[PDB]
Every structure is written in C-alpha cells, then in structure tokens.
Amino acid sequence: KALNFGIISTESQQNLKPQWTPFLQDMEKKLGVKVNAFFAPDYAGIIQGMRFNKVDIAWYGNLSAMEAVDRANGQVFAQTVAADGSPGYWSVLIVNKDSPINNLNDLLAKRKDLTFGNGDPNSTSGFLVPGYYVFAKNNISASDFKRTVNAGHETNALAVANKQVDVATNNTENLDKLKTSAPEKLKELKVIWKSPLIPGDPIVWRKNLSETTKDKIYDFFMNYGKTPEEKAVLERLGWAPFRASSDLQLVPIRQLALFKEMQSVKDNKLAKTTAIQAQLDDLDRLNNALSAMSSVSKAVQ
Amino acid sequence: KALNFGIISTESQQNLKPQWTPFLQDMEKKLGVKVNAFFAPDYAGIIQGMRFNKVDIAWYGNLSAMEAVDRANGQVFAQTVAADGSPGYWSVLIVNKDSPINNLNDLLAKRKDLTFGNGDPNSTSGFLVPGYYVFAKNNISASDFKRTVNAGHETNALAVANKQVDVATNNTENLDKLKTSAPEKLKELKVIWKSPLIPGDPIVWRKNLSETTKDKIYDFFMNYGKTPEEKAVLERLGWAPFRASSDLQLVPIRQLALFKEMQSVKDNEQDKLAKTTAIQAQLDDLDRLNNALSAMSSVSKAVQ
C-alpha cells in the first residue's frame, strides 16, 4: 500500500524536492510502505486533497491546518521545531532594497500607486497575519493597490527581488530558504514590517487512517532525528526533531482569524458580533486553562 | 433570571448546607442574580439535571464531570484546589478499627463473609478508582462479597463507623468532612488501602448558557477569595482560590475508565473483539493528547 504526503507550495517543486525527497525516502525506509510527495499550486490543493483522501498526511501552516481540521477531517499530531530554537516564526512585508517604501506609513500613503503581492489565501504568514495587523487594523484593503496578486512565498520573494512587484508578504522561514535557493536574490530584499510571533507549523493527518497506520506515522515523527543522517535531513528543512502536538496549538490562529472577522464586521449591536465574541471567550478561557495546568501523568495502569 | 447550582451528594444536605449556603449567597450577591442549590439523591440526578437544563453550573468529581461532558452538554471551566496545598485527593478502603482486616490480602481472603459498601456508580473515588485497582486487578467484583450496597461517601463512612457494613469505599477529603461533622465517628475508622493520586474536582457549566452568564460566572470563580470573609468561606469548603481549568483535566480519568472497561469486557466473542478495539482506539487518542500536553510550552496567545 501507499501513503500520500502533502507538501504546501511554500516554494517551487524544484526547490522543495532536495529538502523533502530524502525525508520521504526515510519515511519509506522506516515505515515499510511506499511514500509519495503530493504537491499543488496553492495550499487549497492540499486541503481539498486531504478532504478527498488523496493526501494522508501533510505539512501545513497553522491556517491551512485549521481549515483541514474544520473542512477536511484533519487532526494535528506533531509540530515542527525551528532548528535555532526560535519559539516560532514571523510574517513580513518586503520591498526591494532600492524602494523608497520604508515602512507601513509609506505603504499606506502610496498604496493606490503600488503593486502588491498578497499571499496564498490559506497562508498564515502570507495572508491572515498581514491581513489583520497591516490591513484590517488600518482599515485599508488589498483591493486598494494598483495591482494585487495572491502568490506563494518564493514567488512573492522572487518578484520583489526582480523588481517585478512593489511590495509583498512573506515570512522569516522562507527568507532563510531563499538564502539557499537564490542567495543573490535574498540580497535584493528589505524587510519593512514584521508581525508578532507565529507558532511552528503542524503536521496533520486524516483521522480515518487506520490505527496501525496512525501508530507507525506517530512513532516515526517522534523518533526521527537521532542518527547523524536524519539530523542532517532535519537541518536542511530548518528543523530540529518534531514535538508532539494537538489541535490545541491552533488556538491563537483561531483567535487571530476571529479578531479579523470582527474588525470586518464592525466596519460593515449585531448578532454576528456576539457569535464571534462567544467564540473569543471560549478561546480566552482555554488559554487561561493551558497556562494554569500543573502536571499530567499517565493514569497508572 | 434564576441560576441552579448542582452539588453532588457527598454528604447529607444538613452537612452540605453550612459549607455551601454562604458560598451560594455570596454568588447571588456578586452576580446580581438569584442562585439556588440543586440537590439530588445520587450523582446521576445532577448529571441528568444538567442534561435537561435544570442545573446550570455544578460541583462534580472527575467522573461525574466526564459524564456531564458526554451526556449533559457540560464543560469544565475551573478546578478546585485543596486548602492545604495537596495536588489532589486519594481514594481509600476503610474498615472499623476493631476489625482484624489490615490490608488488601487480609480483605480478599475473607471477602465471602464481608458486607461491602460500594460508592455512587458515578463516583470517581467511590466507585471507579476502587473498581479498577481493587476489583479489576484482583479479578473480582463487588458481587463477590456476602452483601453489597451502593451509597454516598458519608453514608458509607457512618455505616463502617457504626459497624453496619464491614468495609467500604471512601476518599481522604470526605474523611476530613467527617472529622468536622461527626468526629466521634471518624476515630472509629481505619484505612486499609489508598489509591494513586486523583486530580481536584472541577466546576462545570452547561454549554448552552448565555455567553453573558458564562462570563459573569467565570469572573466570579477566578476572583473569589480576596477578602477575609471569602477566604473563610473557601476554608470551610477545604479549598483555596480556584484555578482556570478545562475538559483537559479529565484525560487521566477517561484513561482510567477505559482501562476498567477493557478489563470488564475481557471478563463478561465477536462482541468482545469489536468493543476492545474501539476501546484501544480511544486510549491511543488520549495517549497522544497527553504527550502533546506534556510537551507544550509557554502557551502562544494571540497579540491583538
């Protein structure tokens, strides 16, 4: 039998395969089943792929994971851990080093005369986060720009670098990826804005996978990275060994999405605002619980 | 609009009310709404009460909270904390001091000539925890005693005390409540067996309460105990200030209930197969969730 492992379109296939192919062959080696990379032109392709069971396991951002959870019978089971021990990563806006656009106030003032590279609409760092803090908060909108395009991170970072779009979203992980796939191009970019912290990406599976397959997948993730060859495979990817995780890691990204929905709703007391405040309160209370939690042993068998 | 507050039948009403009346009156005073105690003869009355929206918020043990989450649209929002700093409480078996039973081996050999006081079938410490570690692990059940009866913690401790039943379940918190209500009855008791750690009791509400009511209850619980008067009320209950909690506190009791179910099933053939594998699937899920909870760090909280 065979497993299909979804890879989000952060970068071109040609640039993802050197990082991924060796990880997937090792997954093949340990599991004793064939493992195929499953690519798509946008995050949506992976999410729908999982919904129709063409994807079994996937690397997602928190937003595309949340969607998979909500729409595609998905479930978080591990979390990536940045190799340098960053507690997460960050969203950015970039422009070419030669731009006179130096910051948000410049961008807000000039937006109707600029070309904008917006992110994949299911991207956490690419779409949602700048969507809230830069756009929603300043009640400006992406439609304002002379020209606006939703594109993957590499695409946006290369278009800025090549002076082909004035400004774009990106993230700090993908900028380090660019260091490797196109170093002279990274030299051409300037970060003009940086979001608050975003948590590491989840690995997610479909919940109708057999218990045996779930076990094998979970054991593989939890145990990868102990030998020199595996440790290497992880570094290329930007990662130390995975951490156990659950849908709970998604919480602030749910909060962020509801913050943004509220800004929108008010800009248009409404029932809608109460249904959303309900949801916010639920997440606030759960956040308090998570911080207050002491210890958690296995119930002694 | 009146709020019904459920209180499990650990003790008699008359021993509950002086702990609970001051607490519910301060809650009325703070919330600006009428609060009424809801009692019932067994734990099931509280859980079923909430299921049909007759109980709005309740003090439960872990097991009965679990089934209020599964049956009664419940949700944990706070956890009680022992006043003396204990991280939890313990289940026990108790006999009269005059009895020669001194432990589990002493008990099991003689089990045929003994009368046994089991717990409320929805009680964590009364029924589940002994039902697993004493009964399932020693491959016996409560019917393997000469006579078996199901009762609340105070009923059981008073029956052992008055030499009306030879051995019963109880817990260390209730023994403390009996030291208060019936001190001359407590000194007649001796503990012969003690369970692993049980986590503090949660406070639970029904999820279909208005978000407004939920917010005011939540604020009430998180802020109670600032003044000498509130401190005294908590003290009477044997509690310090509450802490934020969620359904997540219930994971080890879900584990334990499933461990027990798997053993009960082994000892009731196609139907055993279908059930165990459904049980095992639930345990693997809880296992992964537990590993996730121990690995978490300084929780990420959206910056508005």
Q: What is the DSSP string of A124-149?
A: IIIIIHHIIIIIITTT--GGGSSEEE
Question: What distance in Å separates residue A42's CA from the closest CA in chain B?
Answer: 26
A37 phi and psi, to 5 degrees? -70, 135
Element (H, E) at A14: helix A13-31
Report the DSSP beta bridge partners of residue A21.
Answer: none
Question: What distance in Å separates residue B292's CA from the closest CA in chain A?
Answer: 4
Distance CA B112, CA B32 (A): 56
Residue in B196, B287, B292 closest to A248 by CB: B292
Element (H, E) at B194: strand B189-199
Question: What residue in A sits closest to B195 (Cα-Cα)?
Answer: A300
Is A255–B302 a contact, with Cβ atoms under 8 angstroms apart?
yes
A271 touches chain B (CB under 8 A): no
Structure tokens at B176: 């403390």
Residue in A218, A255, A256 closest to B288 by CB: A218
Given resolution (angstroms): 2.2
Q: What's the DSSP call for residue A67?
A: H
Question: What distance in Å separates residue B41's CA from the closest CA in chain A?
Answer: 30
Question: Chain B residues with CB inside 8 Å of A293's CB?
Answer: 245, 248-249, 293
Residue in B211, B248, B255 closest to A298 by CB: B255
Decide: B117 and B154 in contact? Cβ < 8 Å: no
Distance CA A186, CA A300 (A): 53
Decide: A128 and A199 in contact? Cβ < 8 Å: no
Is B296–A287 a contact, with Cβ atoms under 8 angstroms apart?
no
**Three-class SS state of A295:** coil
Report the DSSP beta bridge partners of residue B190.
Answer: B95
| Backbone Cα Rg of chain B | 20
Structure tokens at A36: 């195929």
Residue A265 neighbours by CB distance under 10 Å: 13
Question: Chain B residues with CB inside 8 Å of A296's CB?
Answer: 251-252, 290, 293-294
A272 touches chain B (CB under 8 A): no
A294 touches chain B (CB under 8 A): yes
The interaxial angle of helices B228-236 and B13-31, nearest 10 deg, is 150
Cα A267–Cα A270–Cα A276 angle in degrees, nearest 5: 85
Question: Chain B residues with CB inside 8 Å of A222's CB?
Answer: 291
Is B300–A199 a contact, with Cβ atoms under 8 angstroms apart?
yes
Element (H, E) at A70: helix A62-71
Decide: A66 and A257 in contact? Cβ < 8 Å: yes
Which residues, 6+ apart, have CB-to-CB distance to A155 below 8 Å?
A: A117
B294 touches chain A (CB under 8 A): yes
Distance CA A127, CA B204 (A): 38
Decide: B73 and B206 in contact? Cβ < 8 Å: yes
Distance CA B102, CA B99 (A): 8
The domains of chain B, with CATH numbers, are 1-87+200-246 (3.40.190.10), 88-199 (3.40.190.10), 247-294 (1.20.58.90)
Distance CA B210, CA B57 (A): 12
Structure tokens at A108: 């807000």
| Backbone Cα Rg of chain A | 20
Question: What distance in Å separates residue B283's CA from the closest CA in chain A?
Answer: 11
Decide: B234 and B227 in contact? Cβ < 8 Å: no
Do the strands A167-171 and B167-171 form a parallel or antiparallel pair, or are they unpaired? unpaired
Size of chain B, expressed as the number of residues it contains: 304
Distance CA B179, CA B177 (A): 5
Decide: B192 and B169 in contact? Cβ < 8 Å: no
Question: Chain B residues with CB inside 8 Å of A218's CB?
Answer: 288
Which residues, 6+ apart, have CB-to-CB distance to B117 below 8 Å?
A: B149, B151, B155, B156, B159, B160, B165, B167, B168, B169
Taken in order A262, A267, A271, A272, is the CA torsion positive or negative? negative
Decide: B57 and B74 in contact? Cβ < 8 Å: no
**Three-class SS state of B241:** strand
Distance CA A95, CA B43 (A): 64
Our separate counts of H helices and E strands in chain A read 12, 11
Q: Which of A245, A252, A280, A288 is nearest to B246 (CA)?
A: A288
Residue in B218, B292, B300 closest to A88 by CB: B300
Q: What's the DSSP call for residue A85?
A: -
Decide: A16 and A7 in contact? Cβ < 8 Å: yes
Structure tokens at A282: 């639920």
B179 touches chain A (CB under 8 A): no
Size of interface A-B (CB pairs under 8 A): 102
Distance CA A108, CA B42 (A): 65
Distance CA B77, CA B218 (A): 7
Is B248–A289 a contact, with Cβ atoms under 8 angstroms apart?
yes
Residue B189 neighbours by CB distance under 10 Å: 20
Which residues, 6+ apart, have CB-to-CB distance to B63 below 8 Å?
A: B122, B123, B124, B127, B128, B253, B257
Our separate counts of H helices and E strands in chain B read 12, 11
B295 touches chain A (CB under 8 A): yes
The interaxial angle of helices A13-31 and A228-237, nearest 10 deg, is 150
Question: Chain B residues with CB inside 8 Å of A201's CB?
Answer: none
| Amino acid making up residue B129 | V
Cite the DSSP H helix spans in B104-244. Answer: 104-109, 129-130, 153-161, 172-181, 183-186, 211-223, 228-236
Question: Chain A residues with CB inside 8 Å of B218's CB?
Answer: 285
Is A243–B303 a contact, with Cβ atoms under 8 angstroms apart?
no
